[PDB]
Amino acid sequence: QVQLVQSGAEVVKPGASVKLSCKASGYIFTSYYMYWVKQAPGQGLEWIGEINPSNGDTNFNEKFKSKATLTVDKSASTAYMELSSLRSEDTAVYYCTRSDGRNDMDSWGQGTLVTVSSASTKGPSVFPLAPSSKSTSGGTAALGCLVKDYFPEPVTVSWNSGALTSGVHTFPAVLQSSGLYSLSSVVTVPSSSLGTQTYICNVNHKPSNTKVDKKVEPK
């Protein structure tokens, strides 16, 4: 019932600031401290700081005391973190997380990937990888979606609005020579199914407010 809902991934220019939000529901917001945690891509977790939403008191990992400002809006059940004067080392996933009694971190937001870059946001093109006689194996068929030419990370992909998850592989992005990213998401299904079942890939790229649904049909 505790949910923490963070703002979407975004690109921020070098030297600019960003305000991140974390909306809480399913508990009495003022009853628990709110922590913020940084995870640089491919790295570990680092604590940034905490806020007591009742009295606004804060404490910071010294590394972030000049970087991060924490506020709360009590009425709105929302915690905010503002990050100042961004540099490359600030590219990371930032999490909010509720603390149980200022000890453990028991509920986590989904993370906000902040990419610090002077390059422009670009939404992807989505192309079907259609099942054919060349994508069969042992009575199974593979199909997918190619998600090409986006920036920054991340893209997320679901299938049939989250109802199809078994055998899905959504690959890590690759960096193209252009500096844009590409990824594919694939699934394996029964070959016998291809005339009767419907397969739709749901692609999201929050930095560009891109959502695409693509029905993948046999060629």
Binding site: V37, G44, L45, E46, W47, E50, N59, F60, N61, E62, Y95, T97, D100, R102, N103, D104, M105, D106, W108, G109, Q110, G111, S125, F127, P128, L129, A130, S132, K134, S135, T136, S137, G138, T140, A142, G144, L146, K148, S166, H169, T170, F171, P172, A173, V174, Q176, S182, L183, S184, V186, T188, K219
Partner: protein, 215 residues
Amino acid sequence: IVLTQSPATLSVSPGERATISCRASQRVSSSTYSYMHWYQQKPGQPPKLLIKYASNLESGVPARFSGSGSGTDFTLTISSVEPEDFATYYCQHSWEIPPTFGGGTKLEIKRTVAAPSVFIFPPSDEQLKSGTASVVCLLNNFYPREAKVQWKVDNALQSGNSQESVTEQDSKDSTYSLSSTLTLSKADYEKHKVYACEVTHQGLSSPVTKSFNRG
């Protein structure tokens, strides 16, 4: 306070016991509780609290997880490792401000050898209208990770216009999958007939070729 986790990576066979350790630079125990907590982070997900106060399992967490220790030295044990346990595990103290995290231990699962199933996808007509052709070769559900993919166009070995990506180990069966994408101009695509992906993996006794003929 500095937390030192060891080992950095732990590889276990399915069903074997896994033990990872976290050493605090000073005591984080009172008479009644120890202020060390353990998190599991599965790929693409936020960390999840598994064990609080050294040994108390969080609600919903399976019984094969346990934790122990006091003072400076703490351990997380999985009695029988299952595929879903593939994750990075982090310790964190709450003795004082600031809380700090260990560096993490990556748990890897040494399952049985599995050859890839190979599939190939021509470019979509939708993509071809745009002037580019991507050809995708999928190597699905194999183990271990080492694999070689080579592209041949009209039997000529390609260099320099393909990119590969590999997944992390799968949470249900511990395999990898790999994609190799060959990118060509539409004009170049349309100048050739046979597109083939040739796959080498230790689960196969000879390379496997999957191909199609344009048109």
